[PDB]
Amino acid sequence: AIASEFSSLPSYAAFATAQEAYEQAVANGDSEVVLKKLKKSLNVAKSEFDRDAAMQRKLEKMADQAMTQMYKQARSEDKRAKVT
């Protein structure tokens, strides 16, 4: 099951459409001015990938530490909120 960090977000479809307009326009050579415009809008659209993917990467690092410490954790019977 292939699913990249941002591919699972709804905002990725807006990116995929914006980058498609760019890659199609540059491949077809329709208008040299449209390339410069769509390159600039692509940087905004692609940045949403880097933004979400950075959040998921950082969360993974912190959550991995939270799972590791749970094996080395001391034995203490205290009433805490535990989700499952």
Side-chain angles (χ1 to χ4, degrees), residues 4-84:
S4 312
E5 297 87 279
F6 196 45
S7 186
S8 298
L9 263 69
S11 303
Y12 175 101
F15 158 61
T17 299
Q19 76 82 58
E20 175 174 34
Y22 186 48
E23 293 211 314
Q24 194 68 8
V26 70
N28 284 260
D30 284 298
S31 280
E32 64 181 297
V33 296
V34 169
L35 277 49
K36 288 175 168 61
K37 287 160 60 178
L38 288 177
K39 188 184 176 180
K40 287 288 183 68
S41 69
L42 170 60
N43 285 304
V44 188
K46 213 312 194 71
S47 181
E48 209 76 84
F49 197 126
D50 180 76
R51 195 191 183 190
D52 173 71
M55 190 179 172
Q56 294 195 37
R57 183 73 78 194
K58 200 278 273 75
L59 286 169
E60 187 179 17
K61 281 188 170 289
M62 295 293 267
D64 192 84
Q65 206 77 60
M67 292 173 215
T68 300
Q69 71 180 11
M70 165 173 171
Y71 294 93
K72 304 305 285 78
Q73 195 178 278
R75 206 277 283 279
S76 190
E77 192 181 284
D78 185 60
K79 292 288 181 174
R80 58 166 58 84
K82 187 192 71 173
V83 301
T84 309

